[PDB]
């Protein structure tokens, strides 16, 4: 696997939590500082249906699903699966929202680095039919059996795109909020039976959250999810939008976001009509920051940027001109500086305060647009 280990001093564990078991319940992947660093064995894409899901998203035949599955079906990402949570400290919490065509496990590079710097991360799987695929259970006994019910991406007609994308970003914000509630409630002793039978005991999460230091982060569609979630839920104290796709937002959200907001853009994805929505969020009484990662493409924020070689990567637009490790470090470090400054963290992340300003050879302050 070429998915980067986290650059931070904590060891990183991973597990999955679904609660309740239904289609309206919460599904998320957890990355967290783990007690021991025994084995980086987490299955990156853990079900065949996601490869089928991806193929349907990409426009590909029925065979490409099996091809992708053959290429990546056993690839790991460097986190200790179900490793005990590192005790003795409350950690700041991040809720992460995946982009269109993605699902909870495709942003592990981002998540693992955050976790290795002291964060618990909850990457939610959206059930708005924006994920290539996702599942839930029809009743308790199905959950007990692992008898899954799969939900696949919804292709939209042009007539639909305005209404349905806005309905989806609303649902998405509600799922970020629901997920946050699940964690906060586990943090304060709510007994939960995970709908997945995993070794990780959710009891460990009791009193492990620093409840004042919460952020929502999100890529593309997830970028828009960030802005919508902020406007609804003041439990999120800041937001970080990775190359947001602003189209889903109604004009009412811009006036309603008090919390700090950080836009991190790829150089090659942005276009004026999208950027102008980002500038709408700007007000003298608010903190908004924007940097552009030089020579990066849209997919630089997702794990598939580390899934192929240089040439194939460029061909598929999984990779930009910039090295994918240099990109995602600049994005993780800028973020860490932003999270420290606005969550009030007592760590050394402010050593990358310059990166919030785009003060790097590989950063454009603001936007080229
Ligand atoms: C709104 N949006 C996106 N777009 C809006 C601008 S557009 O030009 O009109 C269309 C794209 C892309 C995206 O990407 C998230 C994402 C999707 C995937 F399918 C991913 O997985 C991929 C992505 C690409 C590829 Cl080629 C493959 C592979 F199977 F072929 F390897 C897998 C992924 F990592 C992230 N998430 C988004 O939310």
Ligand 1: residues whose CB is within 6 Å? 54, 57-58, 68, 99-102, 106, 220-221, 245, 299, 302-304, 307, 316, 318
Q: What sign has the CA pseudo-torsion 165, 23, 138, 58? A: positive
Residue 354 near residue 360 (C-beta atoms within 8 A): yes
* 231 Cβ contact list (under 8 Å, min separation 6): 173, 253, 256, 257
CA dist., res. 366 & res. 297, Å (int): 16
CA dist., res. 131 & res. 21, Å (int): 18
User: How far does the centroid of ligand 1 lie from the alpha carbon of residue 13, in Å?
Assistant: 26
Residue 218 near residue 241 (C-beta atoms within 8 A): yes
Residue 237 near residue 215 (C-beta atoms within 8 A): yes
What is the structure's resolution, reported in angstroms to one decimal?
Answer: 2.4
Burial of 255 (0-12, 13-18, 19+ CB in 10 A): exposed
By annotation, the residues acting in catalysis are 220, 243, 298
If DSSP codes are grouped into helix, strand and coil, which group holds residue 316?
A: helix
Residue 25 near residue 149 (C-beta atoms within 8 A): no
Which domains occur in the chain, in start order?
1-369 (3.40.50.1820)
Q: Which ligand 1 atom minimizes the distance to the CA of 304? A: 34
Burial of 90 (0-12, 13-18, 19+ CB in 10 A): middle
Taking residue 82's Cβ as centre, other Cβ atoms within 10 Å add up to 17
If DSSP codes are grouped into helix, strand and coil, which group holds residue 214?
A: strand
User: How far does the centroid of ligand 1 lie from the alpha carbon of residue 312, in Å?
Assistant: 16
Report the run of H or E that residue 275 belongs to, with start and end: helix 272-280
DSSP 325-369: HHHHHHHHHHHHHHHHHHHT--SSGGGGHHHHTT-STTEEES---
Interior CA angle at 355 toward 209 and 349, to 5°? 35
Q: Where are the beta strands (DSSP E) in the chain?
A: 11-19, 26-34, 42-43, 76-77, 80-81, 91-97, 120-124, 133-136, 149-152, 209-219, 238-242, 261-266, 288-293, 363-365
User: How far does the centroid of ligand 1 lie from the alpha carbon of residue 199, in Å?
Assistant: 32
Experimental technique, in short, is X-ray
Q: Which ligand 1 atom minimizes the distance to the CA of 51? A: 29
161-187 vs 221-232: helix axis angle to the nearest 10? 60
């Amino acid at each position: 696997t070429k998915i980067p280990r986290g650059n931070g001093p904590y060891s990183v564990g991973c597990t999955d939590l679904m609660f309740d078991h239904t289609n309206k319940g919460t599904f998320l992947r957890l990355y967290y500082p783990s007690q021991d660093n025994d084995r980086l064995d987490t299955l990156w894409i853990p079900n065949k249906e996601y490869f089928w899901g991806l193929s349907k998203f990409l426009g590909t035949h029925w065979l490409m699903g099996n091809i992708l599955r053959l290429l990546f079906g056993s690839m790991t990402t460097p986190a200790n699966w179900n490793s005990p949570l590192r005790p003795g400290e409350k950690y700041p919490l991040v809720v992460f929202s995946h982009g269109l065509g993605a699902f909870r496990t495709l942003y592990s590079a981002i998540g693992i680095d955050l976790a290795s710097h002291g964060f618990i991360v909850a990457a939610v799987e959206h059930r708005d039919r924006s994920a290539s695929a996702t599942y839930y259970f029809k009743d308790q006994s199905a959950a007990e059996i692992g008898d899954k019910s799969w939900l696949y991406l919804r292709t939209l007609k042009q007539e639909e795109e305005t209404h349905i994308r806005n309905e989806q970003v609303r649902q998405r914000a509600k799922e970020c909020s629901q997920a946050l509630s699940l964690i906060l409630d586990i943090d304060h002793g709510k007994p939960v039976k995970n709908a997945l039978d995993l070794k990780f005991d959710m009891e460990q999460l009791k009193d492990s959250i620093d409840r004042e230091k919460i952020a929502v982060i999100g890529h593309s569609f997830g970028g828009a999810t960030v802005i919508q979630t902020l406007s609804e839920d003041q439990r999120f104290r800041c937001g970080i939008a990775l190359d947001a796709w602003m189209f889903p937002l109604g004009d009412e959200v811009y006036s309603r976001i008090p919390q700090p907001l950080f836009f991190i853009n790829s150089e090659y994805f942005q276009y004026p009509a999208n950027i102008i929505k980002m500038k709408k969020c700007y007000s003298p009484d608010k903190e908004r920051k924007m940097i552009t990662i030089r020579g990066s493409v849209h997919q630089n924020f997702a794990d598939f940027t580390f899934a192929t070689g240089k040439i194939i990567g460029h061909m598929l637009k999984l990779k930009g001109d910039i090295d994918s490790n240099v990109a995602i470090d600049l994005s993780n470090k800028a973020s860490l500086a932003f999270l420290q400054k606005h969550l009030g963290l007592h760590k050394d992340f402010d050593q990358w305060d310059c990166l919030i300003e785009g003060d790097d050879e590989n950063l454009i302050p603001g936007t080229n647009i």
